[PDB]
């Protein structure tokens, strides 16, 4: 799944 | 494979917007067994970014873990005034978590949509976030 990120 | 949930009610969302800083953390919730691992939620009202300035960012932070890494799937959602889930975001892929590492969505919900009284998302000026984690 493409939509994700971190800090 | 353990699955658990946590509901985060943020009081005075608009009233105390400036006291909430660039980011605010939630209380720590366990695995549903309270034995080995502790998580918490991290939300960014402003998004601290140009592309997500009109958005509220929501993250899942791993506070403590016994092993080196933890693989878990998460799902964020907003609870409306009638308790129903709305504006759900999740990834079918699992993610590796380490002590102090977090995963989430920079663009989780539009602030404009959040503050719109028509959506019924802020009863009593309270934002109620819902998180479901599936540890593998």
Domain boundaries, chain B: 1-136
Q: What is the resolution of this structure in A?
A: 3.0
**In chain B, which residues have their Cβ closer than 8 Å to the Cβ of A1?**
90-93
Q: How far apart are CA B116 and CA B129, in angstroms?
A: 16
Task: Look at A1 and B106 and tell me if their CB atoms are within 8 Å.
Answer: no
Question: Which of B51, B56, B49 is closest to B115 using CA atoms?
Answer: B56
Beta-carbon count within 10 A of B63 CB: 15
Tokens representing B111 are 């602030």
Quote helix, strand, coil % in chain B, to nearest 5: 10, 50, 40
Distance separating the N- and C-terminal Cα atoms of chain A? 18
Q: How far apart are CA B9 and CA B22, in angstroms?
A: 18
CA A6 to mean position of chain CA atoms? 6
Task: Look at A7 and B102 and tell me if their CB atoms are within 8 Å.
Answer: yes
């Amino acid at each position: 799944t493409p939509t994700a990120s971190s800090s | 494979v353990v699955k658990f949930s946590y509901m985060w009610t943020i009081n005075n969302f608009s009233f105390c917007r400036e006291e909430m800083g660039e980011v605010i953390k939630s209380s720590t919730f366990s695995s549903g067994a309270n034995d080995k691992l502790k998580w918490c939620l991290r939300v960014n009202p402003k998004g601290l970014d140009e592309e997500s300035k009109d958005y509220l960012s929501l993250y899942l932070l791993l506070v403590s873990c016994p092993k080196s890494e933890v693989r878990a799937k998460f799902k964020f959602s907003i609870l409306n005034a009638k308790g129903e889930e709305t504006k759900a975001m999740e990834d079918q892929r699992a993610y590796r978590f380490v002590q102090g590492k977090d995963w989430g969505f920079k663009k989780f919900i539009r602030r404009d949509f959040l503050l719109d009284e028509a959506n019924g998302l802020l009863p009593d000026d309270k934002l109620t976030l819902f998180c479901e984690v599936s540890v593998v």
